[PDB]
Amino acid sequence: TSGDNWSKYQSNKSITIGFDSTFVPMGFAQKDGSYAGFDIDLATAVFEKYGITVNWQPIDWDLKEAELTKGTIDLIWNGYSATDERREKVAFSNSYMKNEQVLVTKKSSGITTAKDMTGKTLGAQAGSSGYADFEANPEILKNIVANKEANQYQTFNEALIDLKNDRIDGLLIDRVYANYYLEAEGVLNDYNVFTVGLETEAFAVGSRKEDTTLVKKINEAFSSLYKDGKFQEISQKWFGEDVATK
Numbered sequence: 001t002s003g004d005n006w007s008k009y010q011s012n013k014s015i016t017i018g019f020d021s022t023f024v025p026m027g028f029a030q031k032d033g034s035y036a037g038f039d040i041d042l043a044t045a046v047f048e049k050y051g052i053t054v055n056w057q058p059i060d061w062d063l064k065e066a067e068l069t070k071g072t073i074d075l076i077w078n079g080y081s082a083t084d085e086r087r088e089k090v091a092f093s094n095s096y097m098k099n100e101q102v103l104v105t106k107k108s109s110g111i112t113t114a115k116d117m118t119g120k121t122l123g124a125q126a127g128s129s130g131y132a133d134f135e136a137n138p139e140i141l142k143n144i145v146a147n148k149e150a151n152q153y154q155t156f157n158e159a160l161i162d163l164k165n166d167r168i169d170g171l172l173i174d175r176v177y178a179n180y181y182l183e184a185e186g187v188l189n190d191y192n193v194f195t196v197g198l199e200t201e202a203f204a205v206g207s208r209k210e211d212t213t214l215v216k217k218i219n220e221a222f223s224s225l226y227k228d229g230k231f232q233e234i235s236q237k238w239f240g241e242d243v244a245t246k
């Protein structure tokens with residue numbers, strides 16, 4: 001099939017992967033500007049099995065579908081939540097990690113439950129699966145937060161600066177990000193982090209629907225990495241635990 005480009009990636013020994021370069025701990029710009037993270041390590045190890053080098057392309061998370069469809073990237077791999085809505089537009093690998101959407105509030109707010117966001121200001125990442133679930137499940141938060149809206153941000157880092165500065169009262173965000181970020185910045189004990197009854201997510205790798213062979217190759221590589229020690233090594237490095245879905 002024309003859009004099944006595996007043979008091209010294999011012969012060029014290259015594939016382009018798009019990511020939000022602030023999304024810790026999955027794929028992010030480090031203190032020296034180089035990219036690191038769980039997905040950086042995992043994708044590198046996957047494509048190593050085929051002698052393929054990854055070309056990492058930071059993207060605007062708002063534009064990820066457009067960049068994939070237009071061919072400027074070949075995969076979305078960056079804590080990319082595999083949702084039903086997204087399955088209408090892209091194909092997914094098998095999922096490799098669970099995730100949950102949480103609220104983050106300052107401890108000084110005293111807010112540890114969604115109902116105490118009544119009349120309070122919520123923020124979200126504009127292009128996130130979390131924001132999509134905020135709109136799709138309005139009984140959870142949208143109906144009760146100020147203006148029945150979320151302040152929208154391109155990146156969670158900006159949203160978190162706004163939370164720190166009382167510009168928003170709560171932030172809807174991936175738990176993996178919140179846990180890593182707050183620990184890295186030394187401020188775990190300044191914030192509450194809690195689920196609010198959204199259903200769990202899983203992360204997977206997104207491709208163009210027609211790239212069916214590529215998806216199989218990612219899945220086959222996962223099978224090797226689970227038993228060769230590498231998945232566990234990467235998991236321990238970034239999470240201090242085994243996040244394998246088994």
Ligand SMILES: N[C@@H](Cc1c[nH]c[nH+]1)C(=O)O
Binds near residue numbers: 061174
């Ligand atoms: N998991 C969320 C948030 C995110 C991942 N990378 C950047 N933002 C999503 O898939 O939209």
